[PDB]
C-alpha cells in the first residue's frame, strides 16, 4: 500500500481492476478497469429495511 | 461496435421498470469510451434487460454529464432469431452530453456479430470505437514495406 | 473565465517598478474544435529599464489549441530580438554563403 | 509579542453516529516550525527536495 493506500508494486506500479459501483457497491465486470483503492475511512450505518 | 454474448436463462428482473440506480433492474451493464471534438472522454454505460424471449432492450446513458437526462425510453431493442442470429435493431444513433463546450458525440453504435445462446455467464466479447484523445510523438519506425509509422 | 474563453494577462517581472496588471491584456476565444477564432494577436509594451526604450512587440498566439491534453503545455516560444554579441567564428557554406557565428 | 495568529478551524468530515466512543479520525494543519536542513534527494521525476 502506497501513501494513498493503493495497491502498488516496488516501483509504485498501481494495481488496477474492476471497481465496485452502486449503493451498496457491487462488482461490475462490464465496468472499466480502475485502480483498486483501500481507504481507512470508517463505515457509516445503513438503516434496516428488511428482516 | 459492441459485440456481446447474451444468456437465454437469465430471469426477467422483478424490479420493473428500468432504473439507473437499481443495479438489479438490469441484466447486464457494459461501458464504452467515446470522445468528442475537444477529446473529452464519455463513458457510455449501456444496460441490457431481457423483455421476452429473443428480445433485449438496450439503454444508454453517459456518466460524464451530470446534466444529462435519465434514460427512461428504449435506446434500442435487439430482436434475435431461433439459432442466435441477429434479426433487427442492431444499430442505433447515440448522442452524448455537452461537456466543457465540447459538442455532443453523435455516433452510430452497432450490435453486429452479437450472438445469444446458453452462456454460463454475462460477458462482452468486444468493444471497438474509432475515436481517441490527442496524442504526441513518442516514437517513429520504418516497416519492412517502407511505411514510416509514428507511434 | 468559462468554457473555451481564456483571459490572458501580461506582466513584466524584470521591472522593479512594474505595475500589477489589473485589466485583461487579451481574450482567447476557441471554436468547437479548440482552434483559435479571435484574440490570437495583441500588441504588448514592456517597461523601461536602465533608460532603454520599452519593447513594443506583437505577441501572437498562432496555432494555440485547446483540447483534452493531459495538462497545459507550452509547445513553442519564439522572439526575433537578440542581444549584442562579439564575433566568435566564421564558415563558408556549400552554397558559397559566408556566415559569421 | 508575536502578531496574533487567526486560523480557519474546520470540523468537516466529522460525523456523529453510533461509534463505540468519541474517537478522532484525523487531525490536519498547515502551520509549521523552524528547523535545519537534514537531507536532500532527487526523486525519479527529477524533483530536488530537501527534508
From Swiss-Prot, chain B:
The chain's disulfide connectivity reads: none
Q: Where in the cell is it found?
A: Bacterial flagellum basal body
Q: What superkingdom heads the lineage?
A: Bacteria
Q: Which family does it belong to?
A: Belongs to the flagella basal body rod proteins family.
* Protein name, per record: Flagellar hook protein FlgE
Recite the lineage of the species. Bacteria, Pseudomonadati, Pseudomonadota, Gammaproteobacteria, Enterobacterales
Q: Which gene encodes it?
A: flgE
- What fragment of the full-length protein is this? 153 to 303 of 403
Amino acid at each position: 500500500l502506497d501513501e494513498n493506500r493503493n495497491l502498488v508494486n516496488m516501483q509504485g506500479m498501481q494495481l488496477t481492476g474492476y471497481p465496485a459501483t452502486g449503493t451498496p457497491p457491487t462488482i461490475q465486470q462490464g465496468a472499466n478497469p480502475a485502480p483498486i483503492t483501500i481507504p481507512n475511512t470508517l463505515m457509516a450505518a445503513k438503516s434496516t429495511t428488511t428482516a | 461496435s459492441m459485440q456481446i454474448n447474451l444468456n437465454s436463462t437469465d430471469p426477467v428482473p422483478s424490479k420493473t421498470p428500468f432504473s439507473v440506480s437499481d443495479a438489479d433492474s438490469y441484466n447486464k451493464k457494459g461501458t464504452v469510451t467515446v470522445y468528442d471534438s475537444q477529446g473529452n472522454a464519455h463513458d457510455m454505460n449501456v444496460y441490457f434487460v431481457k423483455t421476452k424471449d429473443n428480445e433485449w432492450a438496450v439503454y444508454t446513458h453517459d456518466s460524464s454529464d451530470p446534466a444529462a437526462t435519465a434514460p427512461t425510453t428504449a435506446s434500442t431493442t435487439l430482436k434475435f432469431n431461433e439459432n442466435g442470429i441477429l434479426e433487427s435493431g442492431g444499430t442505433v444513433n447515440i448522442t452524448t452530453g455537452t461537456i466543457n463546450g465540447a459538442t455532443a458525440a453523435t455516433f452510430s453504435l452497432s450490435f453486429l456479430n452479437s450472438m445469444q445462446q446458453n452462456t454460463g455467464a454475462n460477458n462482452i466479447v468486444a468493444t471497438n470505437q474509432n475515436g481517441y484523445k490527442p496524442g504526441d510523438l513518442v516514437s517513429y519506425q520504418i516497416n519492412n514495406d517502407g511505411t514510416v509509422v509514428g507511434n
